[PDB]
Amino acid sequence: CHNNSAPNYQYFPNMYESVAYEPYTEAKIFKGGKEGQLPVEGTINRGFEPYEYENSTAGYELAKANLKSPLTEEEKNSGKGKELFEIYCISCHGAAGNGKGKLVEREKFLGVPSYKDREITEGSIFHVETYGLNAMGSHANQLSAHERWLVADYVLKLKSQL
Amino acid sequence: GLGCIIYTVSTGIGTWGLNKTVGWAWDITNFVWWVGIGHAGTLISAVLLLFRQRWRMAINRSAEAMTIFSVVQAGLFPIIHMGRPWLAYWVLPIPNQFGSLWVNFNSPLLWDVFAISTYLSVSLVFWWTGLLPDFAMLRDRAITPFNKRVYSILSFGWSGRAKDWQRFEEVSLVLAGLATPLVLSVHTIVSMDFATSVIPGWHTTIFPPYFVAGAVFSGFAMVNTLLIVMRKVSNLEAYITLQHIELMNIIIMITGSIVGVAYITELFVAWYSGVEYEQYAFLNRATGPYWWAYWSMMTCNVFSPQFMWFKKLRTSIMFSFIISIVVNIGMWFERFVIIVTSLHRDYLPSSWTMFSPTFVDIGIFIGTIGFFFVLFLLYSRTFPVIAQAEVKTILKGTGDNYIRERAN
Amino acid sequence: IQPIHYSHKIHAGDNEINCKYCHSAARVSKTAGIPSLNVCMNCHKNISEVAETTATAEYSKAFYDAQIQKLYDAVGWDKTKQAYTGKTQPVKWVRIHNLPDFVYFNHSQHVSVAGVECQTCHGPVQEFEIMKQYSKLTMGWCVDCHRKTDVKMEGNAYYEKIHAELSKKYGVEKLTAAQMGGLECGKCHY
Amino acid sequence: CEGPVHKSIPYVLQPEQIIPGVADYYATTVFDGFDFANLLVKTREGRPIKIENNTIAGAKFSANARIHASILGLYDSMRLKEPKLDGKNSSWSAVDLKIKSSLADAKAKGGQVVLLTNTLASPTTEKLIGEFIAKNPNAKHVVYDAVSSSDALDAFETVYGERALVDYDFSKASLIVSVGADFLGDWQGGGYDAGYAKGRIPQNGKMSRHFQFESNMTLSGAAADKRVPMTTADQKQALVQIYNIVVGASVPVSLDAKFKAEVVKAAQQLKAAGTKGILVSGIEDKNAQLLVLAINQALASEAFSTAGTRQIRKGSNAVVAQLIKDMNAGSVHTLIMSGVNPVYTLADSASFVSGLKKVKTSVAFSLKEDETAAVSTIAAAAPHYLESWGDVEITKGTYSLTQPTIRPIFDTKQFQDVLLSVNGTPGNFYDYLKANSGAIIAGSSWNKVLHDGIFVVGSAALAGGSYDFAGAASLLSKAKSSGELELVLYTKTGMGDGQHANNPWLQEFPDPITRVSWDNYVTVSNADAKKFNLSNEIVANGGLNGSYATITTADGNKLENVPVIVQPGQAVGTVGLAVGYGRKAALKEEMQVGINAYALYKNFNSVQSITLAKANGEHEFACVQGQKTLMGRGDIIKETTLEIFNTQDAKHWNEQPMVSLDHQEVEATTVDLWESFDRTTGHHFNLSIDLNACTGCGACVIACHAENNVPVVGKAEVRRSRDMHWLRIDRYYSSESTFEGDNERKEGIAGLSSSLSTFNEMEKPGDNPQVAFQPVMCQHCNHAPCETVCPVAATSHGRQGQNHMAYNRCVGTRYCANNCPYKVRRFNWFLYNKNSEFDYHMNDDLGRMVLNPDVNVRSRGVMEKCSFCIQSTQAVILEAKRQGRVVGKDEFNNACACSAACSSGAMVFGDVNDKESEVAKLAESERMYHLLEHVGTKPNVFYHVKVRN
Numbered sequence A: 001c002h003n004n005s006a007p008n009y010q011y012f013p014n015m016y017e018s019v020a021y022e023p024y025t026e027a028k029i030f031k032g033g034k035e036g037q038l039p040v041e042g043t044i045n046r047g048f049e050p051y052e053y054e055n056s057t058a059g060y061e062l063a064k065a066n067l068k069s070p071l072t073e074e075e076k077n078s079g080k081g082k083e084l085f086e087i088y089c090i091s092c093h094g095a096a097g098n099g100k101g102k103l104v105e106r107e108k109f110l111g112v113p114s115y116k117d118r119e120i121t122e123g124s125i126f127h128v129e130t131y132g133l134n135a136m137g138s139h140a141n142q143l144s145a146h147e148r149w150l151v152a153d154y155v156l157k158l159k160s161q162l
Numbered sequence B: 001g002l003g004c005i006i007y008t009v010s011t012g013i014g015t016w017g018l019n020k021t022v023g024w025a026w027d028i029t030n031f032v033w034w035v036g037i038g039h040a041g042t043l044i045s046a047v048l049l050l051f052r053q054r055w056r057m058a059i060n061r062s063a064e065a066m067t068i069f070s071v072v073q074a075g076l077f078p079i080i081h082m083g084r085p086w087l088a089y090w091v092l093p094i095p096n097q098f099g100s101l102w103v104n105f106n107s108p109l110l111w112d113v114f115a116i117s118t119y120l121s122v123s124l125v126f127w128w129t130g131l132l133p134d135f136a137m138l139r140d141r142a143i144t145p146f147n148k149r150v151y152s153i154l155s156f157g158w159s160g161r162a163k164d165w166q167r168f169e170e171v172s173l174v175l176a177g178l179a180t181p182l183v184l185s186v187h188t189i190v191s192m193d194f195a196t197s198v199i200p201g202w203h204t205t206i207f208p209p210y211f212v213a214g215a216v217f218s219g220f221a222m223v224n225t226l227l228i229v230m231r232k233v234s235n236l237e238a239y240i241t242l243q244h245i246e247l248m249n250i251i252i253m254i255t256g257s258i259v260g261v262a263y264i265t266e267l268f269v270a271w272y273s274g275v276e277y278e279q280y281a282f283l284n285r286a287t288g289p290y291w292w293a294y295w296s297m298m299t300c301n302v303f304s305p306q307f308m309w310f311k312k313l314r315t316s317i318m319f320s321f322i323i324s325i326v327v328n329i330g331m332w333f334e335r336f337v338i339i340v341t342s343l344h345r346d347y348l349p350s351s352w353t354m355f356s357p358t359f360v361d362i363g364i365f366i367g368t369i370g371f372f373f374v375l376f377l378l379y380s381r382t383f384p385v386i387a388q389a390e391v392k393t394i395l396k397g398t399g400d401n402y403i404r405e406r407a408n
Numbered sequence C: 001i002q003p004i005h006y007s008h009k010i011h012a013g014d015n016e017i018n019c020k021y022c023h024s025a026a027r028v029s030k031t032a033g034i035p036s037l038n039v040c041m042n043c044h045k046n047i048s049e050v051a052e053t054t055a056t057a058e059y060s061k062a063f064y065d066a067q068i069q070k071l072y073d074a075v076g077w078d079k080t081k082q083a084y085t086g087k088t089q090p091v092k093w094v095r096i097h098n099l100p101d102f103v104y105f106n107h108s109q110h111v112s113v114a115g116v117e118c119q120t121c122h123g124p125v126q127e128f129e130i131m132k133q134y135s136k137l138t139m140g141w142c143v144d145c146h147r148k149t150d151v152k153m154e155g156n157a158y159y160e161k162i163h164a165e166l167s168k169k170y171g172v173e174k175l176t177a178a179q180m181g182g183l184e185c186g187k188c189h190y
Numbered sequence D: 001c002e003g004p005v006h007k008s009i010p011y012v013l014q015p016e017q018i019i020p021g022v023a024d025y026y027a028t029t030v031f032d033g034f035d036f037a038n039l040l041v042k043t044r045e046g047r048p049i050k051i052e053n054n055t056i057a058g059a060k061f062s063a064n065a066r067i068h069a070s071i072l073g074l075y076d077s078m079r080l081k082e083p084k085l086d087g088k089n090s091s092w093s094a095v096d097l098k099i100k101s102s103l104a105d106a107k108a109k110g111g112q113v114v115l116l117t118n119t120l121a122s123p124t125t126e127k128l129i130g131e132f133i134a135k136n137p138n139a140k141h142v143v144y145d146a147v148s149s150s151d152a153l154d155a156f157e158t159v160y161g162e163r164a165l166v167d168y169d170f171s172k173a174s175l176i177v178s179v180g181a182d183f184l185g186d187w188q189g190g191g192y193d194a195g196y197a198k199g200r201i202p203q204n205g206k207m208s209r210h211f212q213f214e215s216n217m218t219l220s221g222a223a224a225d226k227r228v229p230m231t232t233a234d235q236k237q238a239l240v241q242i243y244n245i246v247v248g249a250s251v252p253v254s255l256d257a258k259f260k261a262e263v264v265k266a267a268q269q270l271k272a273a274g275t276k277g278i279l280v281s282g283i284e285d286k287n288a289q290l291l292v293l294a295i296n297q298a299l300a301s302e303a304f305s306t307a308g309t310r311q312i313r314k315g316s317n318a319v320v321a322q323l324i325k326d327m328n329a330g331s332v333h334t335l336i337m338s339g340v341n342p343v344y345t346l347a348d349s350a351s352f353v354s355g356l357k358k359v360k361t362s363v364a365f366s367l368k369e370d371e372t373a374a375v376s377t378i379a380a381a382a383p384h385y386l387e388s389w390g391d392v393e394i395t396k397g398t399y400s401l402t403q404p405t406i407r408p409i410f411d412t413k414q415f416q417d418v419l420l421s422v423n424g425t426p427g428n429f430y431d432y433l434k435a436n437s438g439a440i441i442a443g444s445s446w447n448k449v450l451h452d453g454i455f456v457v458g459s460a461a462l463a464g465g466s467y468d469f470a471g472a473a474s475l476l477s478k479a480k481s482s483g484e485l486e487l488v489l490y491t492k493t494g495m496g497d498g499q500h501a502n503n504p505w506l507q508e509f510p511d512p513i514t515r516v517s518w519d520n521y522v523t524v525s526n527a528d529a530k531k532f533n534l535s536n537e538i539v540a541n542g543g544l545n546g547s548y549a550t551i552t553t554a555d556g557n558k559l560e561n562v563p564v565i566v567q568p569g570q571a572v573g574t575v576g577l578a579v580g581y582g583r584k585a586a587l588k589e590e591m592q593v594g595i596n597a598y599a600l601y602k603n604f605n606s607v608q609s610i611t612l613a614k615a616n617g618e619h620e621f622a623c624v625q626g627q628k629t630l631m632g633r634g635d636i637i638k639e640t641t642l643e644i645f646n647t648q649d650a651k652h653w654n655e656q657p658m659v660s661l662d663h664q665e666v667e668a669t670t671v672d673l674w675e676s677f678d679r680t681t682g683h684h685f686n687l688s689i690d691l692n693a694c695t696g697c698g699a700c701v702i703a704c705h706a707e708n709n710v711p712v713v714g715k716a717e718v719r720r721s722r723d724m725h726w727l728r729i730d731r732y733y734s735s736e737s738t739f740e741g742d743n744e745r746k747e748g749i750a751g752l753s754s755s756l757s758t759f760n761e762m763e764k765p766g767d768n769p770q771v772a773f774q775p776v777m778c779q780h781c782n783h784a785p786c787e788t789v790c791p792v793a794a795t796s797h798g799r800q801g802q803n804h805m806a807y808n809r810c811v812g813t814r815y816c817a818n819n820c821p822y823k824v825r826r827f828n829w830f831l832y833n834k835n836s837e838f839d840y841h842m843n844d845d846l847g848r849m850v851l852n853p854d855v856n857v858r859s860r861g862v863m864e865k866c867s868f869c870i871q872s873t874q875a876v877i878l879e880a881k882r883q884g885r886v887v888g889k890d891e892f893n894n895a896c897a898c899s900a901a902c903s904s905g906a907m908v909f910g911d912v913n914d915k916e917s918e919v920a921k922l923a924e925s926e927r928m929y930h931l932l933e934h935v936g937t938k939p940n941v942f943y944h945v946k947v948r949n
């Protein structure tokens, strides 16, 4: 009989479980118990460049001064930069406003400023969006290197309306 | 034999001598061989009926046993050779959780499922109905309370009455009428497993009547050997006479000549045709690695039925017993040769190969033979081997008493 | 029973965290995987305690506060001096949606290409305290939802050869299953 | 059954480069001392899978079959997981201290230190070795090759000034004269496949013809237009005869008149094609190689140049011999070697071992405890290419980098890291490489070099000079050794050397010429077989059996060999013998299969004089292909000649079958009682073979068995002709020396008395026939006979035009293997996954990482089939639909590895409704041709025509 706190019975599982290695499951042979072993340091795959500026207080303002956006005008006026701001950013920062968000109303954690207060260039978003400034985190795990620049053009349009 | 079946089902078809080229051999060979055997009884009880052949009355009952114990043997091969037989139920068009996933209705393998399952089903109720007045004559003996109960259950409430007999006769006439079409159509559907192919040596139009003629021929040859030993063991030689034996021999002779005509028909057409692939296929049978299968097959089928033209050979229980056995050997090769010689040689010379069976191919066949005899042998000690309702309607019409009375 | 008591109800239903935030690989890859423990820190560097108006009749505040600390043991965070240690252990989650590995389902061309809402395949996920499989996934639900839907041909330039055709010839729009060919034994399990 | 519990493990810390479900590609290179290539490594979330080719403006060295199968060496559980010292498990610190102290003692005593290696074409490795030598007063560096080519190197060095090989361009010549060349094989690291094939296509009324002179029979012979059986004592004389014609000279050549009748013709034609001809020869004699240089200079052909010399082979048979002698003669101290295996490859290894007994601190770097690792002091655990860093210069003007793709599985250490630690250099080899990268890379350091994989470096032609080639000609003509029966050693496409001793894909991979697998053998011509009473035979179960034989040499013998009577294999008086199978250390008895023969490589010469005797028993062979000849079936491989192609209408060389109507003839494809389906829109696919480019199609097989998870079957269960392969290469000989000679015997035939004797003689292939290859896979038919008879409806067709094969409704009633007239359909019989009857890479847990997760693994009773690349083309449509684009021109061709991995441009995959692809321009041709059009099955794969002359 079928219970709900345990999976149901099966009739001759010929090809149900895996012989190959589907990505996130557990195995026995590997270094850890995982199945997601880390790549070697210093290597470069096809279609990716490493970011050449180090962490904050010495590489922050060096990235703020001389670092530019490698996009074109066909890609900026597409609306895809707004959709990424609709997902990953309204939870702390405001959607049309700045700092109002969804979570300083509920008072879960405080200390989110506006965009009038801090002057930010188009290369100073990209250094914070990959590393975080003391209360953010690395959003490089979520967004890709083509897509952080699509967000940075949209944030500049939000400061100009303020 | 059962042990061998379990072994190969649980360990793999690769234990058989099958090849990547030759996917069929000995499995379907024995399937169609048993199917051919199981057409004899449905001819004797239906065709001879339709042609008012009085002499069939002493055979009909044992002839029925021959089909119900042989179609069953054939029914094992469609399952045993399967790669994943526990999923066989998918063959049926049953509503399911796969978005009502169905079967197609274009394959002769499916047509075969319908042909065999309905052939058996119909023949089972046919011969069973004929037992009602014979079980009645056993329940009325009731020598033990056990047997009393057994036959009172095996028989239905068959108190033989005017009306009951009237209807009984009509039912048997209808079913005989339906049975002859089944004899033909069922074996034809089996025949189309090869006739509908694209393989040279198989693609043809002669098979639908050809294989049927062969089925009649091999079926009667089998029946005749059992009647010969039966009339001595059971002491029923006063019912199975030399006239019954002679008539069996005559029919075999006739169908043998039909088969012979079909052999020369195929050879003529092959020559007449401009297709090199068809001609080569026949050359391969005449001369090649399986020449001995082909020529021993031809020797048996060509000459065995021709001895029956000589009265001194035809009217001999000794001679006809031997010949009747021989026929079954030749017919086994008939089925074997067609399947194997046409597959190990075909389009693209790089795919040419051989074929040799293993002990588990042989063993399964032996098992079906053994099972056949277990069933038939038990039958002979529990069932009324000669229909009483039938014989008692001819005792006054024919026999060595009443004829002598008529002559004086 | 998951090893942590994670709640899709407080996060996705009361805080209105957007659905693509934690599960981020739905747009690109075929496996919209479980979010790794780096997403469990950039929101939870500043959230140590939970609340006072969120504990229920079944669940207390001290049940939550002593279980959010288990997230700190998996990563290595220390509450006192606010710094990473060097001892990490991953969290063994229990996967509740499974298919046999002859099928080929891909979340990427099935959410981003066809604009399907994220509650019509896995249920109303924001109103669940613990996670529940909602649909049955057994081969007659994949076919049935393909019978009654439309491919999106307005925006894609891949369909300009097909959609500008047959509006002059046959018809205005086509269903997914019986028109584009999405009911063939080599497109789903090969 | 309850059904198991599945768990999933996300990261504690996820790296930026890794996205679950997204494959990554890395630019790496390979060079193992024998094989070499530029390639891409496809990786999963942490590990490498199937090898791709690197084509970023440096597509000069594609991977061969041996390289494609090399991934199994990474995931081989039989590797030295931990280094040993004095036979015991030890640390690397123990190894480091042992080596350093022995070097100190050697310095104090004034001993000998020798490093052994093999052709390390590496600017930075060589520099590091130089530094070692600079620090150590008495270090000698010496290079050891298994199969040597020092005679060629001496000829080039003494004329141009360096030890390097001429990289010939076979696409820049019209007449190819080959005397023992074998350039389509392993000759000088044969990578000339594309160059040759490019000149075999009749674009106009032109085509490069090939003259093959040889003792053995090889692929270049099969791909030749003319082939002359010739022994090595005749070849040397023939070479001088060529010389006397191209270069006006009078040298008294002694050569058979019938041989002169052909040699002279070829030489005069070669001479006539000034600047458009090429002389290539593989005679193991510096003087012969010098004459080749002289002739190619006289021809002044475009194919000959020293601007980019080949740096791949730089050994010496004189230096190695000196080394061996000194080990036994004098006192030799610490010897360190890496990738060197004299015991088993060295013919004089018995003396090598006695030399090892006289040396101290023997250090050997390897992957396995082989025969030399055994007789040593320190067994060092080396990384397997993808576990290491490096750089390779294949040619004179190039530089490339090698990236690791997987973090070290076992406890290994790089050879260069060891050298750095004994030299006293801080850091590691990677850091060393970084420091020395700016010396070559003038552009961006890593971002534009590691990312792409290669870097272009300029070069210049080498100066020539005066040399008495006339003297060399007279020396060669005077040279003569005419005795009795001789043999020639050779390498295989599946077995280059002993680096793949236990590789199941290369053990199973059948020989492209003889069509056998899992074993070694001896090649004897039928004219010799009749003298020695040797033979082979087809038995009742379908496989082959054959006699045994004994090879005797001066002061030695083999006592048990397995001969195969290849009719044209040997010219006359010669024997073929493959070298490289007899290994016994550190491997299972299922892999310990074959004969070594390296003991017969006396003085590094491939040609040896022998005595052949018949033995007692009979051997069984795992033979893949049965019949040797083609029965005159011109409807399979249509061939014609160039002048017919040029002057006659297609009706006379590419004729399609006709069917009679109302007393009228019509193309057979127009007769149809049924109605067709509309596949005019939405990506109708095809696939295109041209038979001229099919040289051997070797690496096309292994790449198709890489995604599709086809299991490995042993020697038995292939011996019964029950193997598992999705595509196959054929082999069709002839009777009476031509394919048109097997169409004159058949069309002239009588009634039933001669046709029982001609069809029995047309399966015995005559002496020196013509060879033809034909790749055969499942062409996805339209009126497919394999469809309609499946009772459980597991097969169907798509709108694109495939044959979709579901692995689910297939309840194995084995019909559809029968109605395929091409008969390419592989039912599986046992369970190949996890049982102990098949102890190959499918069984063990460490070796189930090659298997990609996108294709399922079959269990029992279900059939499988060479489908079109569905698991790639469903991703190419996917990656062109999210963006909002139309699929490009050559985007379908680059994804299906049946076509995107072959060397030449033979296989072409792609779209047809797109009228600008490569397939749509090939389908509209005068060579349009299907297999078996009279069957009426409408295939989707079309062959062209063999246009030989």
Ligand code: HEC
Residues within 6 Å of the ligand: A088, A089, A091, A092, A093, A111, A112, A113, A118, A120, A124, A125, A128, A129, A133, A134, A135, A136, A137, A139, A151, A155, C042, C043
């Ligand atoms: C909650 C964890 C947040 C998320 C989600 C996003 N941001 Fe943020 N951001 C947050 C805080 C608390 C701060 C201030 C931290 C401090 O120490 O002052 C910020 C800061 C920024 C800034 C200004 C950086 C600067 O140097 O002045 C920018 C431009 C910014 N954040 C952008 C940004 C974007 C693009 C986001 C979506 C990926 C985003 N933030 C999310 C809190 C949080």
Ligand code: HEC
Residues within 6 Å of the ligand: C002, C006, C007, C008, C011, C012, C017, C018, C019, C020, C021, C022, C023, C034, C035, C093, C094, C095, C096, C097, C118, C119, C122, C125, C126, C131
């Ligand atoms: C972070 C705050 C999340 C948000 C936003 C969403 N999900 Fe989630 N999800 C999250 C975790 C930590 C887990 C692990 C398993 C668990 O029970 O905690 C999940 C899991 C799921 C699953 C089931 C996974 C499986 O193996 O079957 C589903 C179906 C799922 N999540 C759906 C889902 C939807 C529809 C969301 C938008 C409303 C969503 N998730 C957001 C964490 C987070």
Ligand code: HEC
Residues within 6 Å of the ligand: A091, A108, C004, C005, C006, C007, C010, C011, C015, C017, C021, C022, C035, C039, C040, C041, C042, C043, C044, C047, C049, C050, C051, C052, C054, C055, C064, C067, C068, C071
């Ligand atoms: C890993 C799982 C995560 C991630 C991705 C986020 N948080 Fe949470 N969070 C987490 C745990 C183990 C708990 C306690 C257990 C529970 O079911 O509640 C929480 C709880 C919260 C709370 C406190 C609830 C309250 O106020 O009473 C808040 C607030 C909260 N989570 C917010 C939050 C935000 C803004 C996140 C960024 C998207 C976030 N969480 C992610 C662990 C995890």
Ligand code: HEC
Residues within 6 Å of the ligand: C019, C020, C023, C026, C031, C032, C033, C034, C095, C097, C098, C099, C105, C107, C110, C111, C116, C117, C118, C119, C120, C121, C122, C137
């Ligand atoms: C929001 C993001 C969505 C959307 C719209 C759908 N799913 Fe999918 N789903 C989602 C998550 C976070 C997971 C767990 C990931 C995992 O690998 O377990 C899933 C899981 C599935 C699965 C099981 C995975 C597998 O079998 O390989 C299936 C199947 C599945 N979901 C199907 C499915 C369908 C048909 C959807 C309709 C558009 C769909 N999902 C949407 C999150 C999300």
Ligand code: HEC
Residues within 6 Å of the ligand: C104, C105, C106, C109, C110, C113, C114, C116, C120, C121, C141, C142, C143, C145, C146, C149, C150, C151, C152, C176, C180, C181, C182, C187, C188, D881
């Ligand atoms: C089982 C998993 C499902 C379920 C429950 C749904 N879909 Fe479908 N879907 C699925 C596969 C394997 C494919 C690929 C088929 C192909 O490539 O032709 C699809 C595809 C679609 C598409 C076409 C996408 C395109 O335009 O290229 C659409 C549109 C689509 N699916 C819609 C859809 C809807 C509305 C569903 C109900 C929630 C749905 N799918 C369920 C597999 C599966």
Ligand code: HEC
Residues within 6 Å of the ligand: B098, B101, C099, C100, C103, C137, C138, C139, C142, C143, C146, C182, C183, C184, C185, C186, C187, C188, C189, D793, D794, D806, D808, D809
């Ligand atoms: C041809 C017949 C098809 C078609 C075109 C598809 N399916 Fe699939 N499928 C099929 C069978 C016989 C089975 C069951 C096999 C078994 O051993 O149970 C399946 C199975 C699935 C499943 C799993 C169902 C379960 O676990 O009970 C899923 C999910 C599934 N199929 C999905 C699927 C999709 C998305 C398809 C594209 C429309 C599809 N199937 C086509 C046979 C056939």
Ligand SMILES: *C(=O)CCCCCCCCC
Residues within 6 Å of the ligand: A009, A010, A011, D001, D002
């Ligand atoms: C696992 O042990 C459960 C197996 C369930 C089998 C169901 C059989 C149904 C009746 C034939």
Ligand code: SF4
Residues within 6 Å of the ligand: D778, D779, D780, D781, D784, D785, D786, D787, D803, D819, D820, D821, D822, D823, D824, D825, D865, D937
């Ligand atoms: S070639 Fe064989 S497998 Fe491919 S479609 Fe025709 S019959 Fe079926």
Ligand code: F3S
Residues within 6 Å of the ligand: D786, D789, D790, D791, D792, D793, D794, D795, D809, D810, D811, D812, D813, D814, D815, D816, D817, D862, D863
């Ligand atoms: S005909 Fe059908 S059941 Fe399998 S063996 Fe062939 S797909």
